[PDB]
């Protein structure tokens, strides 16, 4: 008999269990459905269901009626809905985790075992006629070909939100910290274990690499001046390791608490940025306490850029993303009235979705220059060469690629789309679908319904042979767009979830660390709460370049 | 110029935090206190405190007035209170955790590494004048005199609450799956890396170990029969690390999670239980799901396992232990509408606290047979002569020592409590005073007021100087007893929250797996719910014995 949970036979959240030998059950606990599939609401639910309005409305509401905003932003409605976006949105993500790569399961080796990444749904069970449950094609479409066909770049799509370079290279440095897929362990296992803001990027992802970053003086990280200017410090002196391409001798290698970002300019840039916010955060706190010590010096300066990071990817980086007429804010504060777990465990799904090469141009203007991809990649003297604040506002001025709609990927970077989409194999990732429903949308009922265009999604008919079988990251990649925006309905409705759950779980958003004393007193604590993108760079610069998530006007 | 910090000027769970040379100021951030040291009260909090009656009051009244609690029990009232004593208690725990053995303030390297206990108050400065703060002598009392005056025992005192040797056996087991402190890394640190009830002394702390234990098949964990009796395997088969005498070869020595276990008969005899009832339910899993690998029937076996464990402790455990007349209760849903981390970190304190070595008898007695304590410790051969019916009647018969008043300690085991003292003394830990006020108890103002006598409370003032001196464990266990009790105040009202934040703070009693689900379905769900002492032994065994946490009559 074939397994019955490859129908996905529950909704709204019910757990599959096989029972006997051809037989299932579904625990509806609540999940607010009773029955055998959890289809019958219960009077609240049924309630919520008629007077809930569709994640479009919402979306139109948050875009519109400037008059209504200003009014809104000015008053306590702005903390009321933020109350309300951060709570709704967070509870669709299971606290403790729940499943990982080994198991469809909870377990203690899942609960405890942080080396994995975690799961909202189960893998596609191994005993089923086909790859993605029991509908499509005995095989799936070549990972090659869906990229070449669907997602590879012909003319440059810039982003109609405005969003630039400067953003770009602040995503790719900041999900870098929660994102280390491990090569050794393989797929679903990971290196960074905070699983969250813990800035181990910065620090790094264990002790011995932290302790050689470490001046072990002022509470500071070690630093090196090269034409007047502190940069962080060469290998020779913070003997970690570092992906540099072999031969390039150690006195021109940077170390950094992450060990890609000596690859990209755009790394090095925040990972120098950041080391220069954080010894200015011990010259602070050091004429505040002058008899603390190194240990506490530095341990206290990482708490003041784990919120200070947290503040300024709410209130900037999430800001320009959302597009939102609704002045975001963070305020631990705002949930201390509520069941919140101050824990996280990063998901598959998350990292999957967080995969925004469509934001990487065609090159890379820096002032009269443009530098092609060769030029670029991997060149280890352009940061020094040109200066945080001439390549600031070289990356501010510079506009991104749309991440929606289609066909976006320059390709030279395509390669990681296709492994994505194999990878997103391995892991057997439920298909898009089955998404729309854990996270609180309709099924597409067609791949015009999806694409909301003619050719593109004929063709794809005929490969997948049913939207029922859509994969994952192509789903996120190739659904319409909302009007002028960055992405997809999908990637909203996916991502923040996974999103704000990992910025408000960090313990230091939780009742007992959200105090003065963890942050040095009044000093400390203000540095967080006052906190900007603008701040980050021209208080540790000479002189102050346009800095920005968006083009100038 | 001395440490301000030195006199712990604030109260209320206020943060000592020093500023410039010799300043320091109090961080009353939501402690219910305004002011420099955390004094002045809130409107609400003066109400609370007035109108609050005293610790000793509602011991009363909870042990006293059997009426009134045939009543409660059987009424929503047992919920409502039980909801009051476990919310009540585990707030006055951090939640994520504080402070550790390298930070006496908050790290986020305290809350990332496992490795480490936590604790609730911090260390005593180094720069203070006396070694606990600023009162007492310049040198501490002997620590080996202190035990032989005041803690080695003359004659035998028997617990009045009835409690047993079947008790004092559980307590030493179910302990040391969260208290293994690590020899290698020094005090402070810890190879219980679950940090309470994971069962790691089942099923081992770490997964190669784990590993090899498992059969691999059916879920099972190995074992081996002897005399016709499940018995856990030989070294030679589950090649694991064991901590026998130097001699005792490998054949001779039997393999569990814990590796201190050979060690006494009394712990291989739960070892056997446990492994006996974890082999039981995975053959009651197997019958209701035969698509089942090895893998998910061992994984929910062990959840099955912890709950049964949290169930039995809380309405058994803790009952003997209370003497209370409230019928207390494990329903993890009383706390589903509260604000309730279902996160735990072991304490020192709690380390300290537990060392309940009082209980042990003068010698043991198997049925006509009196073992000393020469012949009952590191005993190869005793468990399987006896079997485990025979046991857990010998231990369930058998008094145990009080724990608290004094002078009850076995002078075979009094150098364990020598080194608790000087072990705190390495942790710095805090007066016994301190630790009062922090778990909301009136400090002692005099040795007599503690003691509730004259002989031995002059010998401690002349050896300490002064009672804001006076230890932690010392002081837990020279204190008077509550009339007829195990132990006294201290030992309840420091202990309680510390446990019952350790079994309801585990995961399984969270609202995302507090399900049927999780346990593989009802029978699993039921097996944790109607779980049982008596039932855990019998239905294991041939026969049944005495099996209880008290003596009979
Ligand atoms: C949780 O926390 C615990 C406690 O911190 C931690 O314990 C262990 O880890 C630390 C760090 O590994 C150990 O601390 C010791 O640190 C001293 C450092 O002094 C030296 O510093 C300079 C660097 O030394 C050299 O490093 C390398 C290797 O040789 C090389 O590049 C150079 O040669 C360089 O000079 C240097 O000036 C000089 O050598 C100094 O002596 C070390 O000397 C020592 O060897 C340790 O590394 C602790 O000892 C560990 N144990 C304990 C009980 O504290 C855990 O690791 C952590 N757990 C997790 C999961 O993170
Ligand atoms: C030109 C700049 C970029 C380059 C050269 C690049 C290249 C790569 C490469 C080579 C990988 C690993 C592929 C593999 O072996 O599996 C990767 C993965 C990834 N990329 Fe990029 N990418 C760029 C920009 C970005 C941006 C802007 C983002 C947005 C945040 C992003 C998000 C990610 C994420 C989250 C991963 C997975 C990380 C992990 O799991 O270890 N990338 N990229
Ligand atoms: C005859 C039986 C017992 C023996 C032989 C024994 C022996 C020991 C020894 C040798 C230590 C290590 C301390 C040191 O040497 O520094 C220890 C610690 C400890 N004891 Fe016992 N003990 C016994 C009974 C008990 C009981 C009944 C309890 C009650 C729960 C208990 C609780 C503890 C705890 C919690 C520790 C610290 C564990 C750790 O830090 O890893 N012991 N005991
Ligand atoms: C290992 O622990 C075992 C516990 O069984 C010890 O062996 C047992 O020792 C007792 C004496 O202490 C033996 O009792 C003897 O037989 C009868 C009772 O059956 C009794 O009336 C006699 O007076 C006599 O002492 C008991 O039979 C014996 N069991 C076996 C299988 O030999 C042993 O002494 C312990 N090891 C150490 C180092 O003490
Ligand atoms: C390392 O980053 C460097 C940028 O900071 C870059 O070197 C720069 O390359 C440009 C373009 O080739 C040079 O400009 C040259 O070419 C123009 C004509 O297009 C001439 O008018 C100029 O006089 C000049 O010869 C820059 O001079 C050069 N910058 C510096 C400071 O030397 C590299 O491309 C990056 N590294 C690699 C390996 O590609
Ligand atoms: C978190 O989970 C990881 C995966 O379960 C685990 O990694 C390791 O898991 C096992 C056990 O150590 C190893 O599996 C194999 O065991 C067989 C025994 O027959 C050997 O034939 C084989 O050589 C191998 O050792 C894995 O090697 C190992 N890695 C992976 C990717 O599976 C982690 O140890 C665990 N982390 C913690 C802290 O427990
Ligand atoms: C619960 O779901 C199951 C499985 O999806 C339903 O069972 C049927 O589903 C098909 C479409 O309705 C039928 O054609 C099949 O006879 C049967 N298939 C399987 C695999 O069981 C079932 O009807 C659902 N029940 C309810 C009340 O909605
Ligand atoms: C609370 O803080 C300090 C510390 O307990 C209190 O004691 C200070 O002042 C007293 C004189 O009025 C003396 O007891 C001590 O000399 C002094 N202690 C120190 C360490 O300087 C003080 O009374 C309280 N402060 C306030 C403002 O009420
Ligand atoms: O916030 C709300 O989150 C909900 C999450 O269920 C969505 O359905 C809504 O559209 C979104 O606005
Ligand atoms: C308000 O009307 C809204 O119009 C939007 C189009 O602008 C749609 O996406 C919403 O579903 C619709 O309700
Ligand atoms: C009728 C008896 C009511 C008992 C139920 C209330 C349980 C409150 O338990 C209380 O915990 C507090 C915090 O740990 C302590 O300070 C109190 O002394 C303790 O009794
Ligand atoms: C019933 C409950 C309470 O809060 O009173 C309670 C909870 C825990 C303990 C307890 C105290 C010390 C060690 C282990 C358990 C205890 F003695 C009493």
């Given at each position: 008999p074939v397994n019955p949970c490859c129908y996905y036979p529950c909704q709204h959240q019910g757990i599959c269990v096989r029972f006997g030998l051809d037989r299932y059950q579904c625990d509806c606990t609540r999940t607010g459905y009773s029955g055998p599939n959890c289809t019958i609401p219960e009077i609240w639910t049924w309630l919520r269901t008629t007077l809930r309005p569709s994640p479009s409305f919402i979306?139109?509401?948050?875009?519109?009626?400037?008059?209504?905003?200003?009014?809104?932003?000015?008053?306590?409605?702005?903390?009321?809905?933020?109350?309300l976006?951060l709570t709704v949105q967070s509870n669709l993500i299971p606290s403790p985790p729940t499943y990982?790569?080994?198991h469809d399961y909870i377990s203690?080796?899942s609960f405890?075992?942080?080396?994995?990444?975690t799961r909202i749904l189960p893998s596609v069970p191994?005993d089923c006629?086909?790859?993605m449950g029991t509908k499509?094609?005995?095989?799936?479409?070549?990972?090659?070909?869906?990229?070449?066909?669907?997602?590879?770049?012909?003319?440059?799509?810039?982003?109609?939100?405005?969003?630039?370079?400067?953003?770009?290279?602040?995503?790719?440095?900041?999900?870098?910290?929660?994102?280390?897929?491990?090569?050794?362990?393989?797929?679903?296992?990971?290196?960074?274990?905070?699983?969250?803001?813990?800035?181990?990027?910065?620090?790094?992802?264990?002790?011995?690499?932290?302790?050689?970053?470490?001046?072990?003086?002022?509470?500071?990280?070690?630093?090196?001046?090269?034409?007047?200017?502190?940069?962080?410090?060469?290998?020779?002196?913070?003997?970690?390791?570092?992906?540099?391409?072999?031969?390039?001798?150690?006195?021109?290698?940077?170390?950094?608490?992450?060990?890609?970002?000596?690859?990209?300019?755009?790394?090095?840039?925040?990972?120098?940025?950041?080391?220069?916010?954080?010894?200015?955060?011990?010259?602070?706190?050091?004429?505040?306490?002058?008899?603390?010590?190194?240990?506490?010096?530095?341990?206290?300066?990482?708490?003041?850029?784990?919120?200070?990071?947290?503040?300024?990817?709410?209130?900037?980086?999430?800001?320009?993303?959302?597009?939102?007429?609704?002045?975001?804010?963070?305020?631990?504060?705002?949930?201390?009235?509520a069941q919140f777990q101050?824990?996280?465990?990063?998901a598959?799904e998350?990292?999957?979705?967080?995969?925004?090469?469509?934001?990487?141009?065609?090159?890379?203007?820096?002032?009269?220059?443009?530098?092609?991809?060769?030029?670029?990649?991997?060149?280890?003297?352009?940061?020094?060469?040109?200066?945080?604040?001439?390549?600031?506002?070289?990356?501010?001025?510079?506009?991104?690629?749309?991440?929606?709609?289609?066909?976006?990927?320059?390709?030279?970077?395509?390669?990681?789309?296709?492994?994505?989409?194999?990878?997103?194999?391995?892991?057997?990732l439920q298909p898009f679908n089955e998404y729309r429903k854990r996270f609180g949308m309709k099924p597409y009922t067609?791949?015009?319904?999806?694409?909301?265009?003619?050719?593109?999604?004929?063709?794809?008919?005929?490969?997948?042979?049913?939207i029922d079988?859509?994969?994952?990251?192509?789903?996120?990649?190739?659904?319409?767009?909302?009007?002028?925006?960055?992405?997809?309905?999908s990637?909203?409705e996916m991502?923040?979830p996974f999103?704000?759950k990992?910025?408000?779980?960090?313990?230091?958003?939780?009742?007992?660390?959200?105090?003065?004393?963890?942050?040095?007193?009044?000093?400390?604590?203000?540095?967080?709460?006052?906190?900007?993108?603008?701040?980050?760079?021209?208080?540790?610069?000479?002189?102050?370049?346009?800095?920005?998530?968006?083009?100038?006007?």
């Open positions: 979306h139109f509401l948050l875009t519109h009626g400037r008059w209504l905003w200003d009014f809104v932003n000015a008053t306590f409605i702005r903390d009321t809905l933020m109350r976006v990982n790569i080994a203690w080796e405890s075992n942080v080396s994995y990444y191994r006629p086909t790859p499509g094609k005995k095989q799936l479409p070549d990972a090659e070909f869906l990229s070449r066909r669907f997602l590879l770049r012909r003319k440059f799509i810039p982003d109609p939100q405005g969003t630039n370079l400067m953003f770009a290279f602040f995503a790719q440095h900041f999900t870098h910290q929660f994102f280390k897929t491990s090569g050794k362990m393989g797929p679903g296992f990971t290196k960074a274990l905070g699983h969250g803001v813990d800035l181990g990027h910065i620090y790094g992802d264990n002790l011995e690499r932290q302790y050689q970053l470490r001046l072990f003086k002022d509470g500071k990280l070690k630093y090196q001046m090269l034409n007047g200017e502190v940069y962080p410090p060469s290998v020779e002196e913070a003997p970690v390791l570092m992906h540099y391409p072999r031969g390039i001798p150690p006195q021109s290698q940077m170390a950094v608490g992450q060990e890609v970002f000596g690859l990209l300019p755009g790394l090095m840039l925040y990972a120098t940025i950041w080391l220069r916010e954080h010894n200015r955060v011990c010259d602070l706190l050091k004429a505040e306490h002058p008899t603390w010590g190194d240990e506490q010096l530095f341990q206290t300066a990482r708490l003041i850029l784990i919120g200070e990071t947290i503040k300024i990817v709410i209130e900037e980086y999430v800001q320009q993303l959302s597009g939102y007429f609704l002045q975001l804010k963070f305020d631990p504060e705002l949930l201390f009235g101050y824990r996280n465990r990063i598959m998350f990292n999957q979705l967080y995969h925004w090469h469509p934001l990487m141009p065609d090159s890379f203007r820096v002032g009269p220059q443009d530098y092609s991809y060769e030029q670029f990649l991997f060149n280890t003297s352009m940061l020094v060469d040109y200066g945080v604040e001439a390549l600031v506002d070289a990356f501010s001025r510079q506009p991104a690629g749309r991440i929606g709609g289609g066909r976006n990927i320059d390709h030279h970077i395509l390669h990681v789309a296709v492994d994505v989409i194999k990878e997103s194999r391995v892991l057997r067609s791949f015009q319904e999806l694409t909301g265009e003619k050719e593109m999604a004929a063709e794809l008919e005929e490969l997948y042979g049913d079988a859509l994969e994952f990251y192509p789903g996120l990649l190739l659904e319409k767009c909302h009007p002028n925006s960055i992405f997809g309905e990637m909203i991502g923040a999103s704000l990992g910025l408000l779980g960090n313990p230091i958003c939780s009742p007992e660390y959200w105090k003065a004393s963890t942050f040095g007193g009044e000093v400390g604590f203000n540095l967080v709460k006052t906190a900007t993108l603008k701040k980050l760079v021209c208080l540790n610069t000479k002189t102050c370049p346009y800095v920005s998530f968006h083009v100038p006007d």
